[PDB]
Amino acid sequence: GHIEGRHMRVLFASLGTHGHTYPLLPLATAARAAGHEVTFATGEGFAGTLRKLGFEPVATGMPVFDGFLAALRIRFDTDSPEGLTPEQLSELPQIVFGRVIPQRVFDELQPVIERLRPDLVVQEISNYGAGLAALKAGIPTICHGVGRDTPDDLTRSIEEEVRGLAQRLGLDLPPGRIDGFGNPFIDIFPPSLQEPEFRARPRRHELRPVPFAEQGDLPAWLSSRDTARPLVYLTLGTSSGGTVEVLRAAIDGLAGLDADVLVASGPSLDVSGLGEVPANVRLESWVPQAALLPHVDLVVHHGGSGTTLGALGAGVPQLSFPWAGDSFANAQAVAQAGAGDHLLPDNISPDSVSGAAKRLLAEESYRAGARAVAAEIAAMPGPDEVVRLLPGFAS
């Protein structure tokens, strides 16, 4: 038992992937420092990290792969994607994140919210199941964004599946876009790069896109490299951002440069077949990306929001290979700010990557564009400032 606005029970809830869980960590940490009790619901795999942050971890949802198996069965009556055209497979995402996962998360959070009786729920934008659970339980909720607003087909499809799931759960949602379930919205995307319409949205609040501070060690070789030549960082994320074929094409393109290349392949990408690489290319399974970026001269990636905002925050030029989800939205934002460039899925090769990487390194305008947003980001309200709003949200 606590008094109003002090030592609150705040329930953070996000999808079970790094790209969706990490963005909320800074605010959760700030909430704990403010004296609130943080319970964090997400993939069980994050349990260790959450506990170390002082949070009480809760396991929800399922691995993305398992989600696509479910959708695969629901939609195509099969256990394999084999024989299915990329157009048929592109019908699955809305089922996975609009129905299958939300259903699971809703089922698991209902009893959780029941016992925890949280004063406030911080719902990750794409974690609709958590939004529905809190809605039914009548808990004051705020929507925590992970990137740029995306008013595209993919998002609308996912939202309609969410609507269908809502109906079946006895929850009648308002007509029109989900729009964070009409709750206050925490926007971590650089306002200048944010969709104009969305930036005007009422009850919207800025929050600096702080990169998760992991206490891991940087690769030791950084301490003895030729710091007179560029350091290039290559990564395709942690969830379906790109393929190993694309990673191979990027390595061949970057390896030729007079530069050091650090590659982080992540937990999902199988690189057992990647093969041989020149000595200036180092392959890592995982790196403390937040601590790394300040040392980097160029970030080459899949276009994930976390790495996009990360590069922007560090004032580093970025080359992206947009293909999945909001990767295209982020590519537009980067182009708008002249903070980097991109190559389309049919234009990925050693040559195209090499040429683009050289341009982003040689021409100052790209770094200049990145430094501009880095300043804007630094001027945004920090987690400790925004956290002072939580009591008002709960009340």
Ligand SMILES: Cc1cn([C@H]2C[C@H](O)[C@@H](COP(=O)(O)OP(=O)(O)O)O2)c(=O)[nH]c1=O
């Ligand atoms: C591959 C890799 C990712 N990360 C983190 C940084 C980002 O916050 C997050 C990647 O998320 P993001 O860049 O949004 O792409 P996706 O959501 O497709 O994974 O994972 C590391 O910290 N170290 C690593 O080696």
